[PDB]
Amino acid sequence: MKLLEQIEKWAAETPDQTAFVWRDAKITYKQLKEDSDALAHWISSEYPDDRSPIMVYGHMQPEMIINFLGCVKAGHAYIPVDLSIPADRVQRIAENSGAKLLLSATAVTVTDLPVRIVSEDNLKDIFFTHKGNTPNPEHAVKGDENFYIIYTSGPKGVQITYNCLVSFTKWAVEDFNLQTGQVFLNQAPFSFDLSVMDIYPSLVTGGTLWAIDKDMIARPKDLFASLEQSDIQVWTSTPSFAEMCLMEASFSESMLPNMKTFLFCGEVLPNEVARKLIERFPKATIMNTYGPTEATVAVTGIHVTEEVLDQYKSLPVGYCKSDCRLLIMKEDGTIAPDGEKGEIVIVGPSVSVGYLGSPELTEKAFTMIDGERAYKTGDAGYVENGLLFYNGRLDFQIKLHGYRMELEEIEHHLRACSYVEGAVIVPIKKGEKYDYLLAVVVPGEHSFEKEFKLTSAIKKELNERLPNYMIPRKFMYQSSIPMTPNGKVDRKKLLSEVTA
Ligand SMILES: Nc1ncnc2c1ncn2[C@@H]1O[C@H](COP(=O)(O)OP(=O)(O)OP(=O)(O)O)[C@@H](O)[C@H]1O
Numbered sequence: 001m002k003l004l005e006q007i008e009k010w011a012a013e014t015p016d017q018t019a020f021v022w023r024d025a026k027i028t029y030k031q032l033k034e035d036s037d038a039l040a041h042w043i044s045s046e047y048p049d050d051r052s053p054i055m056v057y058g059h060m061q062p063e064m065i066i067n068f069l070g071c072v073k074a075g076h077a078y079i080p081v082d083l084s085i086p087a088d089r090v091q092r093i094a095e096n097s098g099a100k101l102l103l104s105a106t107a108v109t110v111t112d113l114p115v116r117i118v119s120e121d122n123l124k125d126i127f128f129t130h131k132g133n134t135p136n137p138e139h140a141v142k143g144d145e146n147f148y149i150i151y152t153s154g155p156k157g158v159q160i161t162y163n164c165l166v167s168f169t170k171w172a173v174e175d176f177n178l179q180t181g182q183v184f185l186n187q188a189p190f191s192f193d194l195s196v197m198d199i200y201p202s203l204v205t206g207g208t209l210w211a212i213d214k215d216m217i218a219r220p221k222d223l224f225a226s227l228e229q230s231d232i233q234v235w236t237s238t239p240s241f242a243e244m245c246l247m248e249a250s251f252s253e254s255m256l257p258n259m260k261t262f263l264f265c266g267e268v269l270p271n272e273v274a275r276k277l278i279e280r281f282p283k284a285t286i287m288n289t290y291g292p293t294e295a296t297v298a299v300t301g302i303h304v305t306e307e308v309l310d311q312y313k314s315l316p317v318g319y320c321k322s323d324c325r326l327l328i329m330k331e332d333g334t335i336a337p338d339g340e341k342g343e344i345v346i347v348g349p350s351v352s353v354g355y356l357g358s359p360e361l362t363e364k365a366f367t368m369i370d371g372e373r374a375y376k377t378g379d380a381g382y383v384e385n386g387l388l389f390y391n392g393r394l395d396f397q398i399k400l401h402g403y404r405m406e407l408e409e410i411e412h413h414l415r416a417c418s419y420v421e422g423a424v425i426v427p428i429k430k431g432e433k434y435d436y437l438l439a440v441v442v443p444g445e446h447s448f449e450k451e452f453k454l455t456s457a458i459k460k461e462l463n464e465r466l467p468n469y470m471i472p473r474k475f476m477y478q479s480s481i482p483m484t485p486n487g488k489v490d491r492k493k494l495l496s497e498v499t500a
């Protein structure tokens with residue numbers, strides 16, 4: 001069955017089941033179908049021949065999902081733009097893409113863009129005006145036609161197709177041990193593809209998306225009360241977000257008695273975090289997945305068990321889905337032998353058809369191999385019997401003491417030290433070269449009476465792992481590590497405040 005049909009199926013079998021919920025606003029599979037049908041019909045009547053991508057502005061309102069499906073039912077790809085995206089980048093996206101329409105949940109603040117803006121009331125009138133109407137079944141985006149276009153920080157628009165999303169979703173449902181009618185957490189803003197990991201697997205299995213917004217996360221007591229009521233079963237988020245929840249004593253099986261599946265992607269998953277989770281949720285399975293946005297969310301996955309925890313101090317990123325394959329490459333097109341590190345490369349139906357209008361950018365990253373699209377991740381790693389390991393981004397490989405060290409690796413051994421609960425390394429550069437490393441750490445419990453004593457203890461244990469030239473010169477301590485709007489470590493913010 002087509003992707004949409006797998007979804008529309010629940011509108012029929014389970015019409016009154018909650019499809020999406022954000023705070024008090026809820027929508028059933030029936031309304032979702034009904035309203036997205038009406039929106040699609042409208043889009044077609046307004047743009048009979050055009051199929052340009054459509055922007056969908058908002059945060060966590062149910063209209064975001066209604067609008068996405070409406071856009072694709074009419075043959076248009078959608079571009080999720082979260083309220084957190086700076087206005088300048090939003091305008092860029094407006095002209096960058098060929099978008100001629102922007103649908104908005106709430107009020108659209110960003111200074112007028114060069115597109116037609118349908119918002120708030122306008123959108124409501126459409127659902128009302130076109131209620132009952134249905135789109136031409138044959139207008140639904142298909143095959144290699146764009147489904148959604150999510151942008152890179154900057155600003156490149158990765159084009160994900162129907163076939164791409166179908167390949168990811170089919171895999172996700174299969175190997176993530178998903179069932180039907182489960183409640184899926186949604187922590188990631190829609191302009192971050194990690195959200196796709198829960199949105200579609202949930203919709204095709206008739207689950208319930210339980211959204212957590214930005215303000216709620218800023219007010220911990222609300223977040224946790226919300227989690228206590230969610231009855232979430234499938235947790236999809238970045239490692240950093242789980243860890244912050246973990247900093248909360250009551251966050252365990254007690255708060256989420258039905259938790260059964262954790263899905264992590266986007267950054268390094270600390271062995272300890274997975275450890276605490278396995279402990280706090282003995283009934284749950286932990287999955288670590290890896291992948292860039294250019295390859296449709298994630299391509300590798302592995303069940304992180306105590307066993308894996310016991311034999312892998314540094315957790316692996318998983319096995320590649322069978323319809324794709326991985327390649328590790330060194331200096332030249334030299335395909336490194338299993339065990340050796342090189343840049344990770346992905347090939348298969350998951351790979352993006354390339355950046356939106358920029359054969360210049362699509363040039364270096366994307367290529368063809370035996371007829372299949374391929375993408376260079378910019379990530380360093382290696383394979384061992386089909387199991388992929390992540391070392392770090394090629395860019396976070398710095399040059400100090402005429403020695404080459406990797407940010408991610410140092411952070412790992414640092415995290416391993418006593419008294420260190422959270423840690424990030426900020427490479428400080430004097431002039432145009434890297435002068436020294438600054439360690440920002442969230443201290444665990446301790447009895448030191450003076451800061452210098454704590455820093456000496458950590459540096460001493462750290463020197464038991466890493467060479468002396470890898471040990472950061474300066475340490476700084478704070479109550480928490482900042483997360484960007486996507487839930488990832490805010491390295492930019494950190495470097496900004498080390499400078500200041
Ligand atoms: N399981 C994982 N373990 C470690 N790192 C991961 C994992 N999954 C993803 N990553 C990292 O996250 C990156 C993918 O993130 P994303 O697609 O959001 O773009 P980004 O690199 O974070 O930001 P940008 O917009 O600049 O590209 C990968 O290239 C990889 O370095």
Ligand SMILES: [Mg+2]
Pocket residue numbers: 292378
């Ligand atoms: Mg990238």
